[PDB]
Amino acid sequence: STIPGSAATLNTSITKNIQNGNAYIDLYDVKLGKIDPLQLIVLEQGFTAKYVFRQGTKYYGDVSQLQSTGRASLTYNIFGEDGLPHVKTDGQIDIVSVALTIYDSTTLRDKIEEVRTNANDPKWTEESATEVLTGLDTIKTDIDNNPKTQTDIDSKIVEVNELEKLLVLKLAAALEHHHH
Numbered sequence: 001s002t003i004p005g006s007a008a009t010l011n012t013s014i015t016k017n018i019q020n021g022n023a024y025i026d027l028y029d030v031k032l033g034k035i036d037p038l039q040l041i042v043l044e045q046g047f048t049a050k051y052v053f054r055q056g057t058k059y060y061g062d063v064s065q066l067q068s069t070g071r072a073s074l075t076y077n078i079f080g081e082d083g084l085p086h087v088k089t090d091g092q093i094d095i096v097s098v099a100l101t102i103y104d105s106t107t108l109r110d111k112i113e114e115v116r117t118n119a120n121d122p123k124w125t126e127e128s129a130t131e132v133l134t135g136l137d138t139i140k141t142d143i144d145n146n147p148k149t150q151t152d153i154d155s156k157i158v159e160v161n162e163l164e165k166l167l168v169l170k171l172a173a174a175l176e177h178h179h180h
Contacts, residue, residue: 005088007047007078008096011040016147023074024147027104030063037063041076041096047086049076053100066102069150074100103150105143108157112136115164128168135163 002009012018017025017040029035037051053060055072066072076096078086086094118124119132139156148156 003088003094003096005090006094006096007044007086008041008049008076008094010096010098011042014040016145019147021098023098023100025063025066025100025102026143026147027066027069027102028106028109030066031106035063037074040074040098043078046081048079048081049096050079051076055102069102069104072100072102074098101147101149103148103153105148105153108143108153108160109140111157111160112140115160118164119167123169123171124167125170125173128166132163132166135166136160 010018010021010023017023017035023040025035038049041049043049050061052075053063053066053072054075055066055068055070060066074097076098078094078096080086088094116133116136119129119136139159143153143156
């Protein structure tokens with residue numbers, strides 16, 4: 001929800017990055033520049049905020065610096081118009097910490113395009129050509145709209161490998177439909 005006397009509330013409407021009060025970032029979106037940590041929160045008039053990441057043993061002031069997938073923390077330091085940190089009514093520095101999960105789908109999305117390129121080869125029967133494409137599009141949609149754990153991304157890489165194996169050559173199909 002929102003911490004007692006804070007000037008910043010975490011924006012839950014961005015379901016792709018915010019869930020159950022936790023933040024999620026896909027390095028793919030970071031590389032394609034689709035992420036801006038300051039849009040994940042709502043600042044009430046008269047206060048500015050500067051975010052800071054904390055992963056391993058270092059702090060990152062700019063999301064682009066994030067290079068590894070893992071568990072980290074997103075923190076938002078709130079400041080008043082005087083440039084100094086805001087002190088909440090309870091007498092504490094007004095800061096907002098969000099548990100962050102960093103994952104990267106880059107590899108998966110490529111593995112998908114590979115299988116997709118393969119699936120569209122007219123050498124494969126249209127039933128498999130399509131069953132595999134549906135499979136890929138279902139995953140694709142999911143990784144675009146929903147946040148995932150890196151552990152979860154790798155499992156979908158496996159699902160894709162398996163779907164690619166469903167492809168069936170028209171040649172084979174034609175030798176089976178043969179009755180001697």
